[PDB]
Amino acid sequence: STQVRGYDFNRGVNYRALLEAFGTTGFQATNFGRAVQQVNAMIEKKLEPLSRRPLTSCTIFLGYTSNLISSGIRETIRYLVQHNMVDVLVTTAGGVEEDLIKCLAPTYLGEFSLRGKELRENGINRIGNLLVPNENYCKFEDWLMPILDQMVMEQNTEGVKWTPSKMIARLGKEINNPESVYYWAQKNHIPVFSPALTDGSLGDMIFFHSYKNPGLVLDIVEDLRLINTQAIFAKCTGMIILGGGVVKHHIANANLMRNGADYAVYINTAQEFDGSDSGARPDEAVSWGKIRVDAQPVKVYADASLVFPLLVAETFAQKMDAFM
Amino acid sequence: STQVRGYDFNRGVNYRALLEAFGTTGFQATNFGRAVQQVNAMIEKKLEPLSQDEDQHADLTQSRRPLTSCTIFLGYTSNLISSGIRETIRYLVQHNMVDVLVTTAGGVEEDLIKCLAPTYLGEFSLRGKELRENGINRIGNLLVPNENYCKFEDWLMPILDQMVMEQNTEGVKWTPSKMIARLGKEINNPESVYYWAQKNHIPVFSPALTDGSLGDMIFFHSYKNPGLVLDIVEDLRLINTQAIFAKCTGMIILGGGVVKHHIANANLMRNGADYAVYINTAQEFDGSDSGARPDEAVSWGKIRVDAQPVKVYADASLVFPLLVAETFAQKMDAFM
Amino acid sequence: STQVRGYDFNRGVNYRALLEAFGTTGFQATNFGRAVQQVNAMIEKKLEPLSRRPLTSCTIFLGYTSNLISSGIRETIRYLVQHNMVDVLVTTAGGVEEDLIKCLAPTYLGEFSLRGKELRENGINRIGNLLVPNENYCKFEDWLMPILDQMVMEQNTEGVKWTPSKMIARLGKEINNPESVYYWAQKNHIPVFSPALTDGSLGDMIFFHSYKNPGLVLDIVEDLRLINTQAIFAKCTGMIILGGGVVKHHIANANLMRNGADYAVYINTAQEFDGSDSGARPDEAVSWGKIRVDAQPVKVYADASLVFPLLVAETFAQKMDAFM
Amino acid sequence: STQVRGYDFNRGVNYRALLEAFGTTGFQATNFGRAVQQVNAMIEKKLEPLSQDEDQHADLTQSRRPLTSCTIFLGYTSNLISSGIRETIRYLVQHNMVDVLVTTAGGVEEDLIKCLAPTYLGEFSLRGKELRENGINRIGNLLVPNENYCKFEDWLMPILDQMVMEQNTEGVKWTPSKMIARLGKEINNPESVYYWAQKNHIPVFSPALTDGSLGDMIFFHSYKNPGLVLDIVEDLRLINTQAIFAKCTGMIILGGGVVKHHIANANLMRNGADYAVYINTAQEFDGSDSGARPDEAVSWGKIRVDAQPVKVYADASLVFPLLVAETFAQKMDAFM
Ligand SMILES: NC(=O)c1ccc[n+]([C@@H]2O[C@H](COP(=O)([O-])OP(=O)(O)OC[C@H]3O[C@@H](n4cnc5c(N)ncnc54)[C@H](O)[C@@H]3O)[C@@H](O)[C@H]2O)c1
Ligand SMILES: NC(=O)c1ccc[n+]([C@@H]2O[C@H](COP(=O)([O-])OP(=O)(O)OC[C@H]3O[C@@H](n4cnc5c(N)ncnc54)[C@H](O)[C@@H]3O)[C@@H](O)[C@H]2O)c1
Ligand SMILES: NC(=O)c1ccc[n+]([C@@H]2O[C@H](COP(=O)([O-])OP(=O)(O)OC[C@H]3O[C@@H](n4cnc5c(N)ncnc54)[C@H](O)[C@@H]3O)[C@@H](O)[C@H]2O)c1
Ligand SMILES: NC(=O)c1ccc[n+]([C@@H]2O[C@H](COP(=O)([O-])OP(=O)(O)OC[C@H]3O[C@@H](n4cnc5c(N)ncnc54)[C@H](O)[C@@H]3O)[C@@H](O)[C@H]2O)c1
Ligand SMILES: NCCCCCCCNC(N)N
Ligand SMILES: NCCCCCCCNC(N)N
Ligand SMILES: NCCCCCCCNC(N)N
Ligand SMILES: NCCCCCCCNC(N)N
């Protein structure tokens, strides 16, 4: 029986102690504490001694919505991928393309209230309280077109059967920049799944390109086999899912194929009342077999832009020595 | 300047008057009233004849669906097909009231499965362990027996066999929309959304069609009968061309995610939708595309600067049937 | 085992049938259906044959946040009070004052996005997507001051011991206008509780008045006795609570005094994750004894401006004959 | 123009740098960074000396609390005292870092009760029937035993007897703030927020003080010892005068409801606060005062037009300790 107690600033400011105190603070602070414990359990299982990716004792799936790549959480995710701390990525199309675009031009801070008419008149696109100039996408187009030319050529003459994961690996290799999530993912043989890869600017570009160079095919069937087999052949699995939608369901349903994940942490701002998959508590997933009945899953109800860097500080970044 | 005033029940339960009074009630009631006006504007435009010039341009797609003065995109999250909103959507599709559907994979498969076995009412709080032990799957406060998916497997597997054979011997290049049309034709049931969609030449887009039970089945099927391809590139061309060659467009988007962005992004290709109504429970603060206001879409060119879009912040299970009652259902005579 | 099924518009548009179909539609539509059933159960219990208010077989407490009086839900609430359909009102201070102010000057439709600087420069105050001109409050001041003079005089010479409920009764009598909730409440001997009655424009006015005419006392202790005894001596109780905060807790805690309400319907947009009383599910209230263990309470997760008029249409307005 | 960039953990776990990087991370991380800046602006102003002219005007209240160049109002919902945020608030009050407190009744009583018995961790999903049967009360994912309130009754009843006697024999005119000061003096415990508040002459306002357990006790007490009066009118004068005679004001408001409006409305009386930070989980769509953006308050004159207020959309149990770490705790030396 753990008593409720907050951090006492009469101690001064020890940030480690402050973060530790979340566990006994209550409400979502307590859930954050539980999430730290669950992610540390995944890491410790992964470090136990026992696709071209070599198996470890715990396969960790990391999912995140596209806007988190628009955000500075791009840097957090890149760090985990760079150091081979997770095994599978799932993100929607924006989450792919904006990582690449950020190697060409930056995204800027703005405000949620900025009016669309005036932004559009000035060639600026709004993402929440962020701003992306039109020119960023012009640079993306210039960079991407010759790559898409090569991909079509390789498909039609070298027998390459493109899927989203294979395209994402290629784009990461091409961007050739260590600030990029997907550069690191391909270097470290971490596959990235994104079944609706056409839903975004990369889609726009594929679309425009296809009238100059028809023929590109992106198959989603083989990518389903690939993600599901990552779960089926795992010794243990953990799911860390930031946001909802496709990224959440796709990871959770892959884990249904092994009769459920062993560990699970959700950080999202959705709620159950609307019947949404996004908003479903981890315990809904237990009814399906996506999370094992004996698992102790955790959801933090919060914006991941606040919570994820703190979670990484207290988990993966603490075990940096073991990952090298 | 409009004064705030709610419906006065001293007048009795005059339902039409009650619904009209939402417009002057405030908060989301007022946004509902605005949504009714915006959808009625789409419908009024749709029923306007095409001039010679407009007909020429609108006829530049290869689809055999007859031309109207307003191409209406209807998007909905999968859970809304789990819900009774399935019946609302089916009605609109049955009577050619909308032109393009976008839904995620659950929103395809569960329409088909509901022709085989029903979904039941439950409660949000039911615990997963006991449900799993009794072979019941939870969708919010709804319940789907394991047996529903067994029936789906039995129905679907022979269709998947035919699809692979048609691919390999007849050169069929499958995409999600083509598969959804075929599944609708196969289910052959007037209670099905997708039966009516294919019958009425209304394309359905679902670029992550593998994300659900239909995916499970494709996956298992592929080990006995390998090589089925679902191309998403051709389907991107198809949805975007629906927007590009429209005289006007309206978007009616229930929920967020892929369904919302995919429709809105198609409309960027024509420099923006003329009309838009969002009904969703998302909020902007998290930076989500789901929670972005219509005015964010204006910055991108997905909604015209001159448009007067509306978002209703509510569960669509409450709002959508009311919206349809006051809009499409009022003009049903024109659609027959 | 009830099957999920929505209203079939091939029937045409029968609004009664459409509303009935919410029950089998799922998510919050199903909760709305359950709410209709629970409120009808309250009404039917109230109509069973057995403070100056005569007891009925079910005492119904109606609570609502202040903004719902800013809204057109003012008209919905007024109707119920006018016809003696509920027994006790609880609202916060705005919910009192704006009912009175609306008899003097209207509130207007606006938009949530309107900027504060320009509104303030034009003498307009924003309430969500509503607008209240400064002049409305000038009219309120002119109307209220001579009443406050009388109240002080009655306190100091006729021994009147003012409380929020007594003040609200008096203001209702004074406004003398059948569009007013509180005019009807006092006419029908329905008490109104508002322990923080100073938190709003009526507060501002009491504050300004007190420097011209010092002495007014508003006691909250006697009003606690009054509300709690409404619950203690009831044969049965029902709670209908629109929104959260003081209005929700105050009604629910009164019902703790009788060991719990027999029926309960919440309609609010709050969520549990933040630990808020506003967001607590009805089942939290069961742990306290505020709702009986054998009750079947219902929460609808929605804006009451949408849901409440529909609920009244299917419940109280259907039994209009029995209430006359 | 500031570029979006998150903290790079290749630099190691440098916590100060990690927290500073929230400002360029986007969404609510950026709003957190803005809140840190806004609170530090309040603190910097507070530590600025009062000029002769400013001192004269600021000294026009009867309170004996020493004058500062920025009067800081701290508001919090009751549940935040149920939580460990009680410790965060106590620290600020202990060291005279804020000037006026506003909380609802739970936020008073539970601070006192925590000196008598602890609150425990639980879970949101725990069912009410079984909790009730075991004499346990649920607050979100926290748990309070029945016995805690028995202990509160035993402690409080003799104090209520003294208060009634002082009213009737010494002419004491009780208000919520005066009662809260007395209860703080009586609890006589350095872990208590209200012990420190009364010691440091920080008034606490709670106009619905009867809405909770303290109310329960007053109610039961009144049948044995009738006639206790709690006047809310005098307390309105007292809070509003704190704003009217301030050189500058800042508002730090955790959660919504009475606590938020009461602080903001007091600041309308001086034509608006100079600085404001809201941390709450409410949204604007429902028309709620709780969910109104800071810019709504600008229309009323509760926040100055020239102010740059900030709302962080998050559970304060996560955000507030981080905010304090980066603001008040950094300047602790100046407050001693
Ligand atoms: N930058 C972009 O957002 C962007 C760019 C191009 C394309 N798109 C397209 O939009 C579509 C929908 O985007 P999506 O599926 O990535 O998610 P989304 O933005 O629709 O979010 C889905 C849900 O995830 C949760 N969520 C979102 N942001 C969160 C946060 N910061 N913290 C916690 N929870 C959060 C919310 O509850 C939200 O409703 C995708 O197909 C995507 O490719 C997005
Ligand atoms: N029945 C199912 O929900 C189901 C079944 C199988 C697969 N899936 C898969 O789950 C994935 C995610 O589902 P999704 O993208 O359809 O949406 P989702 O359920 O994740 O919801 C996305 C957002 O839409 C909004 N929303 C959801 N329900 C709403 C309602 N009733 N009213 C208003 N707004 C609402 C919410 O803000 C939510 O965060 C999809 O790829 C889908 O195929 C879902
Ligand atoms: N018009 C006004 O709102 C107004 C005017 C003057 C004073 N005030 C003061 O503001 C203070 C706080 O206001 P409050 O306590 O009345 O409530 P609030 O507006 O703080 O709302 C509390 C909670 O109730 C729920 N809620 C609000 N509106 C809702 C809706 N339309 N549908 C469903 N749920 C809803 C929300 O979850 C919200 O967080 C009060 O003391 C009041 O006197 C308000
Ligand atoms: N422990 C308790 O909660 C408790 C105990 C006894 C009595 N009560 C009574 O309940 C009534 C209502 O409580 P209240 O007015 O203190 O607020 P509340 O709990 O009703 O919350 C009001 C709004 O504040 C916001 N909020 C709540 N918790 C938050 C968090 N952790 N972070 C960010 N925002 C948050 C939410 O939007 C919420 O709707 C009061 O009169 C109080 O005395 C409460
Ligand atoms: N193998 C298919 C799994 C489908 C799970 C769908 C869960 C949807 N849950 C909500 N919409 N709440
Ligand atoms: N043509 C590409 C359009 C991409 C739009 C992405 C908008 C994302 N908005 C958020 N608030 N996430
Ligand atoms: N008789 C006093 C009852 C106090 C109940 C407080 C309940 C608070 N619940 C949350 N904050 N979730
Ligand atoms: N001096 C009286 C101020 C009253 C302000 C009320 C603002 C209510 N705002 C909402 N969004 N409810």
Side-chain angles (χ1 to χ4, degrees), chain A residues 112 116 120 126 199 269 274 281 283 288, chain B residues 124 128 138 261 271 281 286 293 295 300:
Chain A
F112 286 100
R120 179 159 178 217
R126 183 164 77 75
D199 193 41
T269 48
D274 58 11
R281 285 177 285 108
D283 196 59
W288 292 90
Chain B
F124 288 98
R138 186 161 75 74
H261 184 280
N271 227 236
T281 50
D286 58 10
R293 283 176 289 106
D295 194 59
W300 291 90

PDB file of all heavy atoms in Angstrom, chain A residues 112 116 120 126 199 269 274 281 283 288, chain B residues 124 128 138 261 271 281 286 293 295 300:
ATOM      1  N   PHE A 112      -1.169  27.904 -32.526  1.00  0.00           N
ATOM      2  CA  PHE A 112      -2.383  27.224 -33.001  1.00  0.00           C
ATOM      3  C   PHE A 112      -3.387  28.175 -33.627  1.00  0.00           C
ATOM      4  O   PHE A 112      -4.119  27.793 -34.546  1.00  0.00           O
ATOM      5  CB  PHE A 112      -3.074  26.481 -31.859  1.00  0.00           C
ATOM      6  CG  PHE A 112      -2.367  25.224 -31.430  1.00  0.00           C
ATOM      7  CD1 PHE A 112      -1.552  25.212 -30.302  1.00  0.00           C
ATOM      8  CD2 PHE A 112      -2.559  24.031 -32.127  1.00  0.00           C
ATOM      9  CE1 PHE A 112      -0.918  24.051 -29.901  1.00  0.00           C
ATOM     10  CE2 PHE A 112      -1.933  22.876 -31.721  1.00  0.00           C
ATOM     11  CZ  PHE A 112      -1.124  22.878 -30.609  1.00  0.00           C
ATOM     12  N   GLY A 116      -5.714  30.556 -41.336  1.00  0.00           N
ATOM     13  CA  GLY A 116      -5.338  29.839 -42.545  1.00  0.00           C
ATOM     14  C   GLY A 116      -5.186  30.707 -43.780  1.00  0.00           C
ATOM     15  O   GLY A 116      -4.272  30.509 -44.577  1.00  0.00           O
ATOM     16  N   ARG A 120      -1.775  30.866 -45.884  1.00  0.00           N
ATOM     17  CA  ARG A 120      -1.735  30.379 -47.250  1.00  0.00           C
ATOM     18  C   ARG A 120      -1.252  31.469 -48.207  1.00  0.00           C
ATOM     19  O   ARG A 120      -0.465  31.195 -49.125  1.00  0.00           O
ATOM     20  CB  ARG A 120      -3.088  29.863 -47.698  1.00  0.00           C
ATOM     21  CG  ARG A 120      -3.010  29.392 -49.125  1.00  0.00           C
ATOM     22  CD  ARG A 120      -4.100  28.438 -49.502  1.00  0.00           C
ATOM     23  NE  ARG A 120      -3.923  28.111 -50.904  1.00  0.00           N
ATOM     24  CZ  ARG A 120      -4.915  27.930 -51.757  1.00  0.00           C
ATOM     25  NH1 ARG A 120      -6.177  28.023 -51.365  1.00  0.00           N
ATOM     26  NH2 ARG A 120      -4.633  27.652 -53.010  1.00  0.00           N
ATOM     27  N   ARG A 126       0.382  25.079 -41.754  1.00  0.00           N
ATOM     28  CA  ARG A 126       0.335  24.945 -40.293  1.00  0.00           C
ATOM     29  C   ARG A 126       0.172  23.507 -39.837  1.00  0.00           C
ATOM     30  O   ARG A 126      -0.698  22.777 -40.338  1.00  0.00           O
ATOM     31  CB  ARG A 126      -0.796  25.802 -39.697  1.00  0.00           C
ATOM     32  CG  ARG A 126      -0.845  25.757 -38.189  1.00  0.00           C
ATOM     33  CD  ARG A 126      -1.687  26.871 -37.613  1.00  0.00           C
ATOM     34  NE  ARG A 126      -3.129  26.664 -37.716  1.00  0.00           N
ATOM     35  CZ  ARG A 126      -3.842  25.828 -36.960  1.00  0.00           C
ATOM     36  NH1 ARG A 126      -3.258  25.036 -36.060  1.00  0.00           N
ATOM     37  NH2 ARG A 126      -5.160  25.769 -37.111  1.00  0.00           N
ATOM     38  N   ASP A 199      -0.560   8.499 -47.961  1.00  0.00           N
ATOM     39  CA  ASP A 199      -1.376   9.523 -47.297  1.00  0.00           C
ATOM     40  C   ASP A 199      -0.558  10.687 -46.747  1.00  0.00           C
ATOM     41  O   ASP A 199      -0.373  10.829 -45.540  1.00  0.00           O
ATOM     42  CB  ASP A 199      -2.252   8.910 -46.193  1.00  0.00           C
ATOM     43  CG  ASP A 199      -3.317   9.877 -45.721  1.00  0.00           C
ATOM     44  OD1 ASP A 199      -3.904  10.554 -46.604  1.00  0.00           O
ATOM     45  OD2 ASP A 199      -3.542  10.018 -44.502  1.00  0.00           O
ATOM     46  N   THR A 269      -3.625  10.851 -26.239  1.00  0.00           N
ATOM     47  CA  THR A 269      -4.598  11.835 -25.771  1.00  0.00           C
ATOM     48  C   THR A 269      -6.025  11.447 -26.147  1.00  0.00           C
ATOM     49  O   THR A 269      -6.949  12.257 -26.023  1.00  0.00           O
ATOM     50  CB  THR A 269      -4.292  13.171 -26.430  1.00  0.00           C
ATOM     51  OG1 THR A 269      -4.116  12.948 -27.828  1.00  0.00           O
ATOM     52  CG2 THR A 269      -3.018  13.761 -25.850  1.00  0.00           C
ATOM     53  N   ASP A 274     -15.847   7.475 -27.334  1.00  0.00           N
ATOM     54  CA  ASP A 274     -16.288   7.564 -28.732  1.00  0.00           C
ATOM     55  C   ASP A 274     -16.192   6.233 -29.490  1.00  0.00           C
ATOM     56  O   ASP A 274     -16.457   6.163 -30.689  1.00  0.00           O
ATOM     57  CB  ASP A 274     -15.504   8.654 -29.474  1.00  0.00           C
ATOM     58  CG  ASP A 274     -13.991   8.429 -29.448  1.00  0.00           C
ATOM     59  OD1 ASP A 274     -13.542   7.334 -29.043  1.00  0.00           O
ATOM     60  OD2 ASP A 274     -13.243   9.378 -29.786  1.00  0.00           O
ATOM     61  N   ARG A 281      -8.654   1.579 -24.016  1.00  0.00           N
ATOM     62  CA  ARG A 281      -7.686   1.274 -22.975  1.00  0.00           C
ATOM     63  C   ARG A 281      -6.953  -0.014 -23.335  1.00  0.00           C
ATOM     64  O   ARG A 281      -7.468  -0.830 -24.089  1.00  0.00           O
ATOM     65  CB  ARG A 281      -8.365   1.098 -21.616  1.00  0.00           C
ATOM     66  CG  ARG A 281      -8.801   2.407 -20.973  1.00  0.00           C
ATOM     67  CD  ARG A 281      -9.532   2.189 -19.663  1.00  0.00           C
ATOM     68  NE  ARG A 281     -10.893   1.710 -19.888  1.00  0.00           N
ATOM     69  CZ  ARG A 281     -11.346   0.480 -19.649  1.00  0.00           C
ATOM     70  NH1 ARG A 281     -10.581  -0.461 -19.097  1.00  0.00           N
ATOM     71  NH2 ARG A 281     -12.607   0.197 -19.940  1.00  0.00           N
ATOM     72  N   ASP A 283      -6.762  -2.580 -21.651  1.00  0.00           N
ATOM     73  CA  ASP A 283      -7.603  -3.715 -21.299  1.00  0.00           C
ATOM     74  C   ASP A 283      -8.602  -4.116 -22.387  1.00  0.00           C
ATOM     75  O   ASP A 283      -9.060  -5.255 -22.402  1.00  0.00           O
ATOM     76  CB  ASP A 283      -8.339  -3.501 -19.975  1.00  0.00           C
ATOM     77  CG  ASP A 283      -8.895  -4.794 -19.418  1.00  0.00           C
ATOM     78  OD1 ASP A 283      -8.093  -5.730 -19.165  1.00  0.00           O
ATOM     79  OD2 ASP A 283     -10.133  -4.906 -19.259  1.00  0.00           O
ATOM     80  N   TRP A 288      -9.124  -9.090 -27.057  1.00  0.00           N
ATOM     81  CA  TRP A 288      -8.789  -9.574 -28.395  1.00  0.00           C
ATOM     82  C   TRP A 288      -7.652 -10.591 -28.414  1.00  0.00           C
ATOM     83  O   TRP A 288      -7.540 -11.352 -29.360  1.00  0.00           O
ATOM     84  CB  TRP A 288      -8.411  -8.404 -29.316  1.00  0.00           C
ATOM     85  CG  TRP A 288      -9.556  -7.507 -29.618  1.00  0.00           C
ATOM     86  CD1 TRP A 288      -9.939  -6.406 -28.914  1.00  0.00           C
ATOM     87  CD2 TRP A 288     -10.475  -7.630 -30.705  1.00  0.00           C
ATOM     88  NE1 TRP A 288     -11.048  -5.835 -29.487  1.00  0.00           N
ATOM     89  CE2 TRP A 288     -11.398  -6.560 -30.593  1.00  0.00           C
ATOM     90  CE3 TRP A 288     -10.609  -8.530 -31.764  1.00  0.00           C
ATOM     91  CZ2 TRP A 288     -12.439  -6.374 -31.498  1.00  0.00           C
ATOM     92  CZ3 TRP A 288     -11.651  -8.347 -32.666  1.00  0.00           C
ATOM     93  CH2 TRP A 288     -12.552  -7.278 -32.527  1.00  0.00           C
TER      94      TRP A 288
ATOM     95  N   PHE B 124     -18.335  -0.373 -21.680  1.00  0.00           N
ATOM     96  CA  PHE B 124     -16.909  -0.042 -21.734  1.00  0.00           C
ATOM     97  C   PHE B 124     -16.090  -0.739 -20.639  1.00  0.00           C
ATOM     98  O   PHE B 124     -14.928  -1.089 -20.858  1.00  0.00           O
ATOM     99  CB  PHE B 124     -16.698   1.484 -21.641  1.00  0.00           C
ATOM    100  CG  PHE B 124     -17.112   2.235 -22.876  1.00  0.00           C
ATOM    101  CD1 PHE B 124     -18.350   2.864 -22.946  1.00  0.00           C
ATOM    102  CD2 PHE B 124     -16.263   2.325 -23.972  1.00  0.00           C
ATOM    103  CE1 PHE B 124     -18.737   3.552 -24.083  1.00  0.00           C
ATOM    104  CE2 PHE B 124     -16.652   3.015 -25.116  1.00  0.00           C
ATOM    105  CZ  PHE B 124     -17.887   3.638 -25.163  1.00  0.00           C
ATOM    106  N   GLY B 128     -11.098  -7.493 -19.860  1.00  0.00           N
ATOM    107  CA  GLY B 128     -10.589  -8.211 -21.020  1.00  0.00           C
ATOM    108  C   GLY B 128     -10.359  -9.688 -20.780  1.00  0.00           C
ATOM    109  O   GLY B 128     -10.608 -10.503 -21.663  1.00  0.00           O
ATOM    110  N   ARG B 138     -14.092  -6.986 -27.481  1.00  0.00           N
ATOM    111  CA  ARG B 138     -14.723  -5.692 -27.157  1.00  0.00           C
ATOM    112  C   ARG B 138     -14.363  -4.558 -28.122  1.00  0.00           C
ATOM    113  O   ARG B 138     -13.190  -4.330 -28.420  1.00  0.00           O
ATOM    114  CB  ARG B 138     -14.354  -5.260 -25.739  1.00  0.00           C
ATOM    115  CG  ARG B 138     -15.096  -4.006 -25.302  1.00  0.00           C
ATOM    116  CD  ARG B 138     -15.119  -3.817 -23.797  1.00  0.00           C
ATOM    117  NE  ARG B 138     -13.847  -3.366 -23.234  1.00  0.00           N
ATOM    118  CZ  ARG B 138     -13.360  -2.125 -23.340  1.00  0.00           C
ATOM    119  NH1 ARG B 138     -14.008  -1.195 -24.024  1.00  0.00           N
ATOM    120  NH2 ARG B 138     -12.204  -1.821 -22.763  1.00  0.00           N
ATOM    121  N   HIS B 261      -7.454  12.856 -43.330  1.00  0.00           N
ATOM    122  CA  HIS B 261      -6.356  13.399 -44.122  1.00  0.00           C
ATOM    123  C   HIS B 261      -6.449  13.019 -45.592  1.00  0.00           C
ATOM    124  O   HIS B 261      -6.193  13.840 -46.471  1.00  0.00           O
ATOM    125  CB  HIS B 261      -4.998  12.964 -43.561  1.00  0.00           C
ATOM    126  CG  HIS B 261      -3.860  13.586 -44.290  1.00  0.00           C
ATOM    127  ND1 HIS B 261      -3.412  13.111 -45.501  1.00  0.00           N
ATOM    128  CD2 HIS B 261      -3.126  14.691 -44.025  1.00  0.00           C
ATOM    129  CE1 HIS B 261      -2.436  13.879 -45.939  1.00  0.00           C
ATOM    130  NE2 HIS B 261      -2.249  14.849 -45.067  1.00  0.00           N
ATOM    131  N   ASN B 271      -6.996  22.645 -55.292  1.00  0.00           N
ATOM    132  CA  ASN B 271      -6.879  23.877 -54.534  1.00  0.00           C
ATOM    133  C   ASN B 271      -8.014  24.117 -53.526  1.00  0.00           C
ATOM    134  O   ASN B 271      -8.340  25.257 -53.193  1.00  0.00           O
ATOM    135  CB  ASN B 271      -6.728  25.059 -55.477  1.00  0.00           C
ATOM    136  CG  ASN B 271      -5.610  25.979 -55.065  1.00  0.00           C
ATOM    137  OD1 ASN B 271      -5.825  27.178 -54.859  1.00  0.00           O
ATOM    138  ND2 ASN B 271      -4.397  25.439 -54.966  1.00  0.00           N
ATOM    139  N   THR B 281     -14.260  13.909 -32.258  1.00  0.00           N
ATOM    140  CA  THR B 281     -13.986  14.081 -30.837  1.00  0.00           C
ATOM    141  C   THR B 281     -12.530  14.434 -30.538  1.00  0.00           C
ATOM    142  O   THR B 281     -12.111  14.394 -29.382  1.00  0.00           O
ATOM    143  CB  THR B 281     -14.308  12.778 -30.103  1.00  0.00           C
ATOM    144  OG1 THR B 281     -13.675  11.692 -30.786  1.00  0.00           O
ATOM    145  CG2 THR B 281     -15.800  12.552 -30.083  1.00  0.00           C
ATOM    146  N   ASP B 286      -2.787  18.548 -29.138  1.00  0.00           N
ATOM    147  CA  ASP B 286      -1.767  17.510 -29.244  1.00  0.00           C
ATOM    148  C   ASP B 286      -1.030  17.547 -30.591  1.00  0.00           C
ATOM    149  O   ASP B 286      -0.158  16.717 -30.865  1.00  0.00           O
ATOM    150  CB  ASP B 286      -2.395  16.121 -28.995  1.00  0.00           C
ATOM    151  CG  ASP B 286      -3.516  15.795 -29.942  1.00  0.00           C
ATOM    152  OD1 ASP B 286      -3.703  16.542 -30.920  1.00  0.00           O
ATOM    153  OD2 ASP B 286      -4.253  14.819 -29.653  1.00  0.00           O
ATOM    154  N   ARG B 293      -8.360  21.923 -36.529  1.00  0.00           N
ATOM    155  CA  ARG B 293      -9.553  22.618 -36.984  1.00  0.00           C
ATOM    156  C   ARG B 293      -9.591  22.714 -38.508  1.00  0.00           C
ATOM    157  O   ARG B 293      -8.560  22.653 -39.177  1.00  0.00           O
ATOM    158  CB  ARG B 293      -9.632  24.023 -36.377  1.00  0.00           C
ATOM    159  CG  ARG B 293     -10.096  24.026 -34.936  1.00  0.00           C
ATOM    160  CD  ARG B 293     -10.092  25.404 -34.294  1.00  0.00           C
ATOM    161  NE  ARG B 293      -8.735  25.877 -34.051  1.00  0.00           N
ATOM    162  CZ  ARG B 293      -8.094  26.818 -34.741  1.00  0.00           C
ATOM    163  NH1 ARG B 293      -8.673  27.496 -35.729  1.00  0.00           N
ATOM    164  NH2 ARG B 293      -6.842  27.096 -34.421  1.00  0.00           N
ATOM    165  N   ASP B 295      -9.815  25.337 -40.137  1.00  0.00           N
ATOM    166  CA  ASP B 295      -8.996  26.467 -40.551  1.00  0.00           C
ATOM    167  C   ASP B 295      -7.513  26.103 -40.699  1.00  0.00           C
ATOM    168  O   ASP B 295      -6.783  26.799 -41.380  1.00  0.00           O
ATOM    169  CB  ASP B 295      -9.132  27.660 -39.608  1.00  0.00           C
ATOM    170  CG  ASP B 295      -8.576  28.920 -40.211  1.00  0.00           C
ATOM    171  OD1 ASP B 295      -9.070  29.322 -41.294  1.00  0.00           O
ATOM    172  OD2 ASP B 295      -7.626  29.497 -39.652  1.00  0.00           O
ATOM    173  N   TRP B 300      -3.162  24.968 -45.869  1.00  0.00           N
ATOM    174  CA  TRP B 300      -2.579  24.008 -46.816  1.00  0.00           C
ATOM    175  C   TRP B 300      -3.174  24.100 -48.210  1.00  0.00           C
ATOM    176  O   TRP B 300      -2.556  23.660 -49.171  1.00  0.00           O
ATOM    177  CB  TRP B 300      -2.804  22.577 -46.315  1.00  0.00           C
ATOM    178  CG  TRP B 300      -2.011  22.238 -45.098  1.00  0.00           C
ATOM    179  CD1 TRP B 300      -2.383  22.392 -43.802  1.00  0.00           C
ATOM    180  CD2 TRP B 300      -0.686  21.696 -45.074  1.00  0.00           C
ATOM    181  NE1 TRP B 300      -1.374  21.977 -42.964  1.00  0.00           N
ATOM    182  CE2 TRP B 300      -0.320  21.546 -43.721  1.00  0.00           C
ATOM    183  CE3 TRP B 300       0.227  21.328 -46.067  1.00  0.00           C
ATOM    184  CZ2 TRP B 300       0.914  21.043 -43.335  1.00  0.00           C
ATOM    185  CZ3 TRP B 300       1.458  20.826 -45.685  1.00  0.00           C
ATOM    186  CH2 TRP B 300       1.788  20.685 -44.321  1.00  0.00           C
TER     187      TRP B 300
END
